[PDB]
Amino acid sequence: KNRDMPLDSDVFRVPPGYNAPQQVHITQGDLVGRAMIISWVTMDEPGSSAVRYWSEKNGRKRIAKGKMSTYRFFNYSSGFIHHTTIRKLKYNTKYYYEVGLRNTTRRFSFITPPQTGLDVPYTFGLIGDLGQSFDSNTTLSHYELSPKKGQTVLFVGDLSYADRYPNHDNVRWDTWGRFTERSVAYQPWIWTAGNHEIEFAPEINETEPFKPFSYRYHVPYEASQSTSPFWYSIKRASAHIIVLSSYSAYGRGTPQYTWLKKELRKVKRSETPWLIVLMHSPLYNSYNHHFMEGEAMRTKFEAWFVKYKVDVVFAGHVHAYERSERVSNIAYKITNGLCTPVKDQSAPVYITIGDAGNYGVIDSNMIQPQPEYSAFREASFGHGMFDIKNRTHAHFSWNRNQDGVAVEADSVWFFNRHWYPVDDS
Amino acid sequence: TNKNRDMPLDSDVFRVPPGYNAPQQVHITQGDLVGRAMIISWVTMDEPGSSAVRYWSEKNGRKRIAKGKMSTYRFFNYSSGFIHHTTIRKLKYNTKYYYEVGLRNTTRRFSFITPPQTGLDVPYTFGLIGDLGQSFDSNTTLSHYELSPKKGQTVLFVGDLSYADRYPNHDNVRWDTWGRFTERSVAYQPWIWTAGNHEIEFAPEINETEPFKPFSYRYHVPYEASQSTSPFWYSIKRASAHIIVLSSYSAYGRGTPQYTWLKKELRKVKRSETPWLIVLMHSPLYNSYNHHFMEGEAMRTKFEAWFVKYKVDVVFAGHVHAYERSERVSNIAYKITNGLCTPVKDQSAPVYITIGDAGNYGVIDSNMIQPQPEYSAFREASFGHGMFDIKNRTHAHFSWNRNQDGVAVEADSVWFFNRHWYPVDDST
Ligand SMILES: *[C@@H]1O[C@H](CO)[C@@H](O[C@@H]2O[C@H](CO)[C@@H](O[C@@H]3O[C@H](CO[C@H]4O[C@H](CO)[C@@H](O)[C@H](O)[C@@H]4O)[C@@H](O)[C@H](O)[C@@H]3O[C@H]3O[C@H](CO)[C@@H](O)[C@H](O)[C@@H]3O)[C@H](O)[C@H]2NC(C)=O)[C@H](O[C@@H]2O[C@@H](C)[C@@H](O)[C@@H](O)[C@@H]2O)[C@H]1NC(C)=O
Ligand SMILES: *[C@@H]1O[C@H](CO)[C@@H](O[C@@H]2O[C@H](CO)[C@@H](O[C@@H]3O[C@H](CO[C@H]4O[C@H](CO)[C@@H](O)[C@H](O)[C@@H]4O)[C@@H](O)[C@H](O[C@H]4O[C@H](CO)[C@@H](O)[C@H](O)[C@@H]4O)[C@@H]3O)[C@H](O)[C@H]2NC(C)=O)[C@H](O[C@@H]2O[C@@H](C)[C@@H](O)[C@@H](O)[C@@H]2O)[C@H]1NC(C)=O
Ligand SMILES: *[C@@H]1O[C@H](CO)[C@@H](O[C@@H]2O[C@H](CO)[C@@H](O[C@@H]3O[C@H](CO)[C@@H](O)[C@H](O)[C@@H]3O)[C@H](O)[C@H]2NC(C)=O)[C@H](O[C@@H]2O[C@@H](C)[C@@H](O)[C@@H](O)[C@@H]2O)[C@H]1NC(C)=O
Ligand SMILES: *[C@@H]1O[C@H](CO)[C@@H](O[C@@H]2O[C@H](CO)[C@@H](O[C@@H]3O[C@H](CO)[C@@H](O)[C@H](O)[C@@H]3O)[C@H](O)[C@H]2NC(C)=O)[C@H](O[C@@H]2O[C@@H](C)[C@@H](O)[C@@H](O)[C@@H]2O)[C@H]1NC(C)=O
Ligand SMILES: *[C@@H]1O[C@H](CO)[C@@H](O[C@@H]2O[C@H](CO)[C@@H](O[C@@H]3O[C@H](CO)[C@@H](O)[C@H](O)[C@@H]3O)[C@H](O)[C@H]2NC(C)=O)[C@H](O[C@@H]2O[C@@H](C)[C@@H](O)[C@@H](O)[C@@H]2O)[C@H]1NC(C)=O
Ligand SMILES: *[C@@H]1O[C@H](CO)[C@@H](O[C@@H]2O[C@H](CO)[C@@H](O[C@@H]3O[C@H](CO)[C@@H](O)[C@H](O)[C@@H]3O)[C@H](O)[C@H]2NC(C)=O)[C@H](O)[C@H]1NC(C)=O
Ligand SMILES: *[C@@H]1O[C@H](CO)[C@@H](O[C@@H]2O[C@H](CO)[C@@H](O)[C@H](O)[C@H]2NC(C)=O)[C@H](O)[C@H]1NC(C)=O
Ligand SMILES: CCCCCCCCCC(=O)N[C@@H](c1cccc2ccccc12)P(=O)(O)O
Ligand SMILES: CCCCCCCCCC(=O)N[C@H](c1cccc2ccccc12)P(=O)(O)O
Ligand SMILES: *[C@@H]1O[C@H](CO)[C@@H](O)[C@H](O)[C@H]1NC(C)=O
Ligand SMILES: [Cl-]
Ligand SMILES: [Cl-]
Ligand SMILES: [Cl-]
Ligand SMILES: [Fe+3]
Ligand SMILES: [Fe+3]
Ligand SMILES: [Zn+2]
Ligand SMILES: [Zn+2]
């Protein structure tokens, strides 16, 4: 039943050297891709928050300075968490960066995206509910061996599953950071907050929602004028990506509601044709597990997604894969009986991709027969790839952990809802 | 937009209590779970002053001192005066107490009457006031409440207090005036506070990004007494009623603090101690007015089935500037593809009452969905207030009084039959 990887697993090895940086991870640090947040932990002493970096093209070494933080959770004391934003990066350029400049230096690299534009191709990985089981490791292996070559991971929430351990044993956040480093140190992952990040534990006097996650994983939320790390937007290549918080407030007048309504107004499909929404809890879901948990946010935001021609909504939370038809359920007025989802070519596709591994359990129970709103579903571990070719075409594919790394078990062409709104069913 | 109907600053209801550093904007609310405590609140403008409260019952008369805390805030270019909150505890039930504030310079005296101990057949009269504001209509509603022959003993307040956020930069002076205006009631009987959308004051354009800041500095609630982690949701018991206060503009997704709190809190209700189970929220789950139609749908998906499972007697809300009383219905059978989305009569469900018509800034919400739906019993766009008069464990009498009527006329009334002790069809 415990399918979590043991503490002495190779993927959790501590990088050697006195105060060697560990749990190194990067994410986009600005609105348009010219910056990068570099994050890592030192365990032996605070160390330096400086990052040394240079482009392959110019080879000029520069230093950026950041900030160190620590937290406590019950009887756990963290190591020294560093976050440093490197700025004014050149587009479409390979950079190297080094952390741990005082004692044990470690070097990594990333490639900045091209400048935002109509036809800029870009390959997004889709990972959800990863955890640290053996299944999780297989999914990560399949992602990094994919011939499609993902360039940025859109991560739809539920990271370490540390909160399943006694007192949320936050050592299991540290192991998760060491395990995922082999990917996220070299390409950004775009973070969404899920229910396993809430860690609301009044019984051990831990009452601040999202505390361990928010200390460890920073996002560039001020760059889209959000007032909270849990909802924010970034642009990358031909995509505008909106990250939402299933477990924050979204009533009319609340910060998240206000921010999203204004952010949708700011989207420019003439600059980023692909409009992508990330959230943890799926609004369309025909699995037994968490059935209808997404109704609340759906009543608030579904009609806006249709009005603004969102291309696709990605969610996790359900430990399985599902791809909806383009559907809407926005005509209900309490007493008019109109509560059945209908085919709606102006609506986004809703994809559930929470099947990366969690702690080793798949959600296999489905409502039968498959409802008309659901196009394809399967209870298998795996990951997705959203591969943009240009302003009109993107190719989505789903890869199963039991298939070869080059095998797509589901795949479908997306026709852009703004630039090429022809029926893609 | 809209003609300015707010009472002007030199109005008599806004007069400053005289004397150097005289306490103003005095208000009280229940300070504990069961009614043996009171939070005393007030503002001093000239200097910090003392947070001490001198209090004594009229029977014995032994004078005691409770020590509280002082705080201040800024909002854009506004700086608050000095805000005091002080909790008097271990009071005797059903007892008149005198209390005094301003002990260093200008003392002012007030009084309150503690409720009886909680119990199955304890009568008690609650006023219902929503979306009050500080227009001339607001002043009439409060006058009608004060003059009611039924004698309200505690106000259940369903949100939208001062409407200060309608002024430029939310001119927080209009919080002070509202405090001075409502003192003539709330300094002498508790008002039970619910947070509405006008308390959010989310104003990133002037760098004020902390939800509820002015409200939460000025109005405290005994939220830790029900083991809540936030002032915006909590519960209290008073006489024969168990009152649950919820926050429409906080998170209530599964696993969130409020959601988790409410689910545990409902399990603590014991209808043999407090037979009347009452919920307050700002945004109504049932509402057949065009203004804010279906805004309550999100919370309804999370909580309506719980209200029916625990046989809540009544849910009070404001937000819509009008009056409405539902039938006992539920709409909890929907499963996406089973097509069951019409409310049905359900004798385990509460009655939903919208009572957000106390005045606001002088505007009534008169556009209604047509025809009146089956789930709506009575609706009318008039300014007024309600009274929930508990007689015993089986009967409570609700009445609605209109500002255009005499203070003793009820344009709507209905006997509530208790859902635990007497679940009889009380419709119409
Ligand atoms: C943060 O708080 C956590 C919760 O308190 C700490 O974890 C607890 O740490 C205590 C140690 O103080 C553990 O208790 C001990 O468990 C010993 C284990 O022996 C077991 O080994 C065999 C292996 O085959 C088992 O099959 C069998 O169960 C056997 O008992 C035990 O020998 C000790 O007696 C001791 O106390 C046990 O006895 C009590 C007396 O009645 C029992 O009531 C109780 O069941 C105790 O287990 C405890 O198990 C552990 N709890 C959990 C949930 O993990 C944590 O401590 C840190 O982590 C643990 C795992 C240890 O390594 C500990 O040394 C370390 O400090 C705290 N962390 C920090 C940083 O402070
Ligand atoms: C935006 O991106 C999308 C997705 O990539 C583009 O759509 C693709 O466009 C390419 C062309 O650029 C299409 O590939 C071409 O397909 C034809 C037809 O293939 C079929 O028929 C063959 C016989 O006719 C058959 O043998 C074959 O197996 C298949 O069944 C191929 O003939 C063609 O290959 C030949 O031409 C190229 C070009 O010189 C040579 O290099 C080859 O050696 C061959 O001689 C080529 O592979 C592809 O099918 C499209 N994909 C999809 C999913 O539609 C899109 O292009 C635009 O839209 C398509 C539909 C066409 O109208 C394009 O011409 C058009 O540009 C991109 N949009 C823009 C504006 O670029
Ligand atoms: C972690 O990294 C710091 C900074 O690089 C180390 O501190 C530095 O250690 C050097 C030893 O190689 C010190 O310089 C040496 O001084 C001698 C004569 O004093 C000179 O020949 C020449 O300048 C040498 O480089 C240097 O002063 C020191 N810098 C400080 C303390 O700011 C640190 O070394 C460890 O801590 C210091 C306090 C010493 O005790 C070292 O022996 C010890 O290894 C590094 N820490 C570890 C654990 O490796
Ligand atoms: C508001 O209330 C404060 C506190 O009561 C007043 O300040 C206090 O004034 C006392 C004199 O009335 C000061 O007396 C001190 O104690 C003994 C007697 O107990 C004196 O014999 C001795 O000389 C001390 O000075 C007391 O120090 C002072 N407390 C403070 C300042 O914290 C205040 O009075 C105003 O300020 C004081 C300083 C005097 O100048 C008064 O004339 C003046 O009115 C009160 N303010 C007002 C406007 O009423
Ligand atoms: C709880 O409180 C309700 C409301 O006050 C009680 O119901 C009321 O009981 C009164 C008896 O004390 C009734 O008054 C009498 O009415 C007749 C007309 O039929 C008059 O001629 C007579 O002079 C009295 O005025 C009153 O009508 C009634 N009100 C309602 C709305 O029903 C209730 O009493 C209990 O239930 C009622 C239905 C009767 O069975 C009563 O006998 C019985 O005690 C109170 N319940 C409890 C448990 O205390
Ligand atoms: C708000 O409503 C209240 C209650 O209806 C009004 O109170 C009335 O105003 C003052 C007290 O605030 C009282 O004034 C009295 O009348 C003469 C003037 O004719 C005055 O000179 C006397 O000294 C005396 O105090 C009046 O009796 C009182 N009425 C009551 C308590 O029933 C208040 O005016 C209203 N304010 C606004 C702005 O609408
Ligand atoms: C997780 O998956 C990786 C990648 O498949 C495994 O990496 C292997 O590590 C061993 C020793 O650590 C090497 O000898 C192999 O060459 C690696 N395999 C590949 C394909 O690179 C890793 O062992 C897995 N860890 C766990 C705990 O399952
Ligand atoms: C379907 C028609 C348009 C959608 C709803 C817009 C109309 C609501 C605005 C209003 O007419 N009234 C209330 C109000 C005040 C201030 C902020 C509000 C934010 C959201 C809501 C109300 C607010 P009110 O002024 O009555 O308090
Ligand atoms: C059966 C005991 C063995 C281990 C149990 C640990 C499983 C926790 C994580 C999980 O497997 N499921 C979460 C979940 C499941 C069921 C109900 C839930 C209700 C509220 C929130 C989450 C819920 P998750 O958030 O991951 O879906
Ligand atoms: C305060 O006001 C506006 C917020 O929209 C902005 O121009 C200014 O930079 C803000 N100051 C901050 C965020 O420090
Ligand atoms: Cl270092
Ligand atoms: Cl809402
Ligand atoms: Cl939810
Ligand atoms: Fe999960
Ligand atoms: Fe209102
Ligand atoms: Zn989840
Ligand atoms: Zn309102």
Per the CB < 8 A criterion, the answer to whether A294 and A283 are in contact is yes
Residue B388: name the closest of B364, B349, B355, B427 by CA.
Answer: B355
Structure tokens at B165: 């956020």
Quote the CA–CA distance of B408 and B401 in Å, as a whole number.
Answer: 8
Residue A103: name the closest of A31, A60, A44 by CA.
Answer: A44
Residues annotated within the binding site of A for Zn(2+) are: 158, 195, 280, 317
Are A66 and A125 found together in one domain?
Answer: no
Residue A153: name the closest of A181, A129, A183 by CA.
Answer: A183
Helix/strand/coil (H/E/C) assignment for every residue in A370-401? CCCCEEEEECCCEEEEEEECCCCEEEEEEEEC
Quote the CA–CA distance of B88 and B190 in Å, as a whole number.
Answer: 13
CA A85, A231, A257, A211 dihedral sign is negative
Residue A272: name the closest of A385, A150, A89, A119 by CA.
Answer: A119
Structure tokens at B273: 């101690």
Are B181 and B73 found together in one domain?
Answer: no
> How many Cβ atoms sit within 10 Å of the Cβ of residue B144?
21
Residue A313: name the closest of A241, A214, A207, A416 by CA.
Answer: A241
Please state how this structure was obtained.
X-ray
CA A354, A360, A365, A369 dihedral sign is positive
Helix (H) or strand (E) holding B412: strand B412-417
Bridge partners of residue A314, in order along the sequence: A278, A351
Q: Is A196 a catalytic residue?
A: no
- E-strand ranges in B130-223 read 154-157, 191-193
User: Rg of chain B over CA atoms, in angstroms?
Assistant: 21
Residues annotated within the binding site of A for Fe cation are: 129, 158, 161, 319
Strand order in the sheet with A94-99: A62-65, A50-55, A94-99, A106-111
CB within 8 Å of A225: residues ≥ 6 apart: A259, A262, B204
Nearest Cα of chain A lies from the Cα of B139 at a distance, in angstroms, of 27
Q: Is A251 in the pocket of ligand 8 (CB under 6 A)?
A: no
Structure tokens at A181: 């480093």
Q: Is residue B192 part of a domain?
A: yes
- Coil, helix or strand at residue B17: coil
Residue A350: name the closest of A311, A392, A391, A393 by CA.
Answer: A311
Instruction: Please name the residue of chain A whose CA is at the shortest distance from the CA of residue B334.
Output: A339
Q: Is B253 in the pocket of ligand 9 (CB under 6 A)?
A: no
- Coil, helix or strand at residue B27: strand
- Coil, helix or strand at residue B288: coil
Are B91 and B187 found together in one domain?
Answer: no
Per DSSP bridges, beta strands A312-315 and A274-278 are parallel
Are B41 and B177 found together in one domain?
Answer: no
Q: Is residue B321 part of a domain?
A: yes
- Coil, helix or strand at residue B407: coil
Residue B57: name the closest of B114, B129, B108, B116 by CA.
Answer: B114
Are A27 and A84 found together in one domain?
Answer: yes
Quote the CA–CA distance of B90 and A298 in Å, as a whole number.
Answer: 47
Residue A298: name the closest of A262, A244, A370, A374 by CA.
Answer: A244
Bridge partners of residue A415, in order along the sequence: A393
Structure tokens at B254: 């599964």
Quote the CA–CA distance of A198 and A161 in Å, as a whole number.
Answer: 11
Nearest Cα of chain B lies from the Cα of A382 at a distance, in angstroms, of 26
Q: Is residue A7 part of a domain?
A: no
Q: Is residue B3 part of a domain?
A: no
Q: Is residue A5 part of a domain?
A: no
- Coil, helix or strand at residue B197: helix
Instruction: Give B-chain residues touching A371 at CB under 8 angstroms.
Output: 336-337
Residue A159: name the closest of A150, A149, A168, A148 by CA.
Answer: A168
Instruction: Give the domain-ending residue among A65, A100, A116.
Output: A116
Per the CB < 8 A criterion, the answer to whether A133 and A360 are in contact is yes
Quote the CA–CA distance of B27 and B81 in Å, as a whole number.
Answer: 15
Are B126 and B180 found together in one domain?
Answer: yes
- Per-residue DSSP letter, B7: P
CB within 8 Å of B61: residues ≥ 6 apart: none
**Nearest 5°: CA angle at B233, between A256 and B391?**
140
Q: What is the number of residues in chain B?
A: 428
User: How distant, in Å, are the alpha carbons of A118, A152, A413, A425 from that of A392?
Assistant: 9, 20, 10, 15
Per the CB < 8 A criterion, the answer to whether A113 and A236 are in contact is yes
Quote the CA–CA distance of A60 and A92 in Å, as a whole number.
Answer: 17
Quote the CA–CA distance of B108 and B320 in Å, as a whole number.
Answer: 37
Per the CB < 8 A criterion, the answer to whether B94 and B121 are in contact is no
Residue A323: name the closest of A402, A260, A384 by CA.
Answer: A384
Per the CB < 8 A criterion, the answer to whether B127 and B156 are in contact is yes
Per DSSP bridges, beta strands B124-129 and B154-157 are parallel
Whose tokens are 């392959």? That residue is: A56
Instruction: Give A-chain residues touching B212 at CB under 8 angstroms.
Output: none
**Which residue blocks in B107-154 are alpha helix, DSSP H?**
136-146
Domain boundaries, position B383 = 119-428
Q: Is residue A361 part of a domain?
A: yes
Structure tokens at B335: 């499963």
User: How distant, in Å, are the alpha carbons of B64, B99, B116, B236 from that of B96?
Assistant: 15, 10, 11, 20
B375 Cβ under 8 Å from any chain A Cβ: yes
Are A112 and A123 found together in one domain?
Answer: no
**Nearest 5°: CA angle at A304, between A302 and A308?**
125
Structure tokens at A344: 């709606």
Are A276 and A326 found together in one domain?
Answer: yes
Nearest Cα of chain B lies from the Cα of A196 at a distance, in angstroms, of 9
Bridge partners of residue A215, in order along the sequence: none
Helix/strand/coil (H/E/C) assignment for every residue in chain A? CCCECCCCCHHHCCCCCCCCCEEEEEEECCCCCCCEEEEEEECCCCCCCEEEEEECCCCCCEEEECEEECCEECCEECCEEEEEEECCCCCCCEEEEEECCCCCCEEEEEECCCCCCCCCCEEEEEECCCCCEHHHHHHHHHHHCCCCCCCEEEECCCCCCHHHCHHHCCHHHHHHHHHHHHHHCCCCEEECCCHHHCCCEHHHCECCCCHHHHHHCCCCHHHHCCCCCCCEEEEECCEEEEECCCCCCCCCCCHHHHHHHHHHHHCCCCCCCEEEEECCCCCCCCECCCCCCCHHHHHHHHHHHHHCCCCEEEECCCCCEEEECCEECCCCCCCCCCCCCEECCCCCEEEEECCCCCCCCCCCCECCCCCCCEEEEECCCEEEEEEECCCCEEEEEEEECCCCCCCCCEEEEEECCCCCCCCCC
Are A69 and A172 found together in one domain?
Answer: no
Quote the CA–CA distance of B217 and B234 in Å, as a whole number.
Answer: 17
- Coil, helix or strand at residue B102: coil
Diameter over CA atoms, chain A: 69
User: How distant, in Å, are the alpha carbons of A65, A385, B228 from that of A377?
Assistant: 46, 16, 40
Instruction: Please name the residue of chain B whose CA is at the shortest distance from the CA of residue A340.
Output: B337
Are A103 and A192 found together in one domain?
Answer: no
> How many Cβ atoms sit within 10 Å of the Cβ of residue B216?
19
Instruction: Give the domain-ending residue among B96, B118, B140.
Output: B118
Quote the CA–CA distance of B83 and B215 in Å, as a whole number.
Answer: 12
CB within 8 Å of A93: residues ≥ 6 apart: A55, A56, A57, A111, A112
Quote the CA–CA distance of B88 and B43 in Å, as a whole number.
Answer: 17
DSSP one-letter string for B323-377: EEEE-SEE-----SSS---S-EE-TTSPEEEEE--S-TTS-----B-SSPPTTEE
Q: Is residue B75 part of a domain?
A: yes
Residue A101 identity: L
**Nearest 5°: CA angle at B170, between B169 and B173?**
110
Quote the CA–CA distance of B258 and B221 in Å, as a whole number.
Answer: 15
> How many Cβ atoms sit within 10 Å of the Cβ of residue B188?
15
Instruction: Give B-chain residues touching A225 at CB under 8 angstroms.
Output: 204
Instruction: Give the domain-ending residue among B118, B137, B154.
Output: B118
Give φ, ψ of B348 to 5 degrees: -90, -5
Q: What's CA B415's distance to the chain center, in Å?
A: 22
Structure tokens at A80: 């020294």
Per the CB < 8 A criterion, the answer to whether A273 and A238 are in contact is yes
Give φ, ψ of B257 to 5 degrees: -55, -50
User: How distant, in Å, are the alpha carbons of A18, A40, A70 from that of A187?
Assistant: 26, 14, 25
Q: CA-CA-CA-CA torsion for A214, A218, A221, A227, nearest 10 degrees?
A: 30
Whose tokens are 């000095």? That residue is: B82
Per the CB < 8 A criterion, the answer to whether A208 and A165 are in contact is no
Residue A35 identity: A
Quote the CA–CA distance of B168 and B175 in Å, as a whole number.
Answer: 13
| Residues in chain A that come right before a backbone break, where C and next N are over 2.5 Å apart | none
Structure tokens at B36: 């043996």
Q: Is A102 in the pocket of ligand 3 (CB under 6 A)?
A: yes
- For chain B, the domain total comes to 2
Q: Is residue A3 part of a domain?
A: no
Are B238 and B307 found together in one domain?
Answer: yes
Diameter over CA atoms, chain B: 69
Are A101 and A223 found together in one domain?
Answer: no
Burial class of residue B316 in the structure, from the number of CB atoms within 10 Å of its CB (0-12 exposed, 13-18 middle, 19+ buried): buried
